Amino acid sequence: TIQPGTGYNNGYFYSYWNDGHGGVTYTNGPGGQFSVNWSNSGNFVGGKGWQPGTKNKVINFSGSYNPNGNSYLSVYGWSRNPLIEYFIVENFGTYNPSTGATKLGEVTSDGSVYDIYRTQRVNQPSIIGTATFYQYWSVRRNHRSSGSVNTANHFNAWAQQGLTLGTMDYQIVAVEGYFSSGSASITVS
Numbered sequence: 526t527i528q529p530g531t532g533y534n535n536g537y538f539y540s541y542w543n544d545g546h547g548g549v550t551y552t553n554g555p556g557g558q559f560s561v562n563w564s565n566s567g568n569f570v571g572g573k574g575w576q577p578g579t580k581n582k583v584i585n586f587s588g589s590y591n592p593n594g595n596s597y598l599s600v601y602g603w604s605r606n607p608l609i610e611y612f613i614v615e616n617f618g619t620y621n622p623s624t625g626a627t628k629l630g631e632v633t634s635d636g637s638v639y640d641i642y643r644t645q646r647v648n649q650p651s652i653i654g655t656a657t658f659y660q661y662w663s664v665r666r667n668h669r670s671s672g673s674v675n676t677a678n679h680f681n682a683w684a685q686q687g688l689t690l691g692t693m694d695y696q697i698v699a700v701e702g703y704f705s706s707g708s709a710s711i712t713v714s
C-alpha cells in the first residue's frame with residue numbers, strides 16, 4: 526500500500542490520487558501490475574503506465590475488476606495546452622460516465638464500437654491546480670477487463686470530431702472510484 530502521489534515502480538509510471546475521504550488502498554505489484562481494494566471510498570484514481578504518454582501507444586491490460594457501485598476501468602490520462610482529462614472506458618460499475626452527456630460520434634476499435642462524448646469540469650482538481658477543463662470520453666459498448674487499446678484510433682476520432690489534445694502528460698490504465706467499494710487487480714504493458 527502506498528502514499529498518494531506519482532513515481533516509478535518496476536519500470537512503470539504510476540499515479541495514485543484520492544480526495545482524502547478514506548476507504549481505498551492502492552498497491553503496486555511486480556512488473557506492470559497494480560491492485561486496488563476499496564470499501565466506502567471517496568473519489569480516487571490510480572494505476573500504471575507512462576509519463577509522458579504518446580498519441581499512438583498500443584496499451585495492453587489484463588486482470589480482474591469487481592466494482593460495487595460507481596467506478597470505471599479505463600485508459601486514463603491528460604494533455605496540457607490545452608488541459609484535457611481523457612478516458613477510454615473499458616468497463617464500469619453502476620454508472621455510465623457519459624450519462625446525460627452529448628454524443629459526439631462513434632469509433633470502432635479493438636473489437637467493439639465506442640461512443641464519444643465531451644464533458645466539462647468547473648473549478649476542479651487537475652495536474653496544474655484547480656481549473657476548468659474539458660474531458661474526452663470513448664465509452665466501450667462491450668465491457669471487458671482484459672484487452673488491447675489502440676489509443677491512436679481514439680485520439681484520431683476525437684480530433685476528427687473537434688476534440689483536440691495538447692501535449693501528452695501521463696497515460697495509465699486506471700481504476701477510478703467515486704464513493705463506492707470494490708476490488709481490482711490489473712497488469713499493464
Ligand SMILES: O[C@@H]1[C@@H](O)[C@H](O[C@@H]2CO[C@@H](O[C@@H]3CO[C@H](O)[C@H](O)[C@H]3O)[C@H](O)[C@H]2O)OC[C@H]1O
Nearest residue numbers: 540542569570610646649650651652653654701
Ligand atoms: O498535488 C497535486 C496532485 O494532487 C494532482 O493530482 C491530480 C489531481 O486531479 C486528479 O484528477 C481528478 C481525478 O478524478 C476524476 O477523474 C476528476 O475529474 C479529476 O479532477 C488527477 O487524477 C491527479 O493526477 O496532480 C498535481 C499535483 O500538484
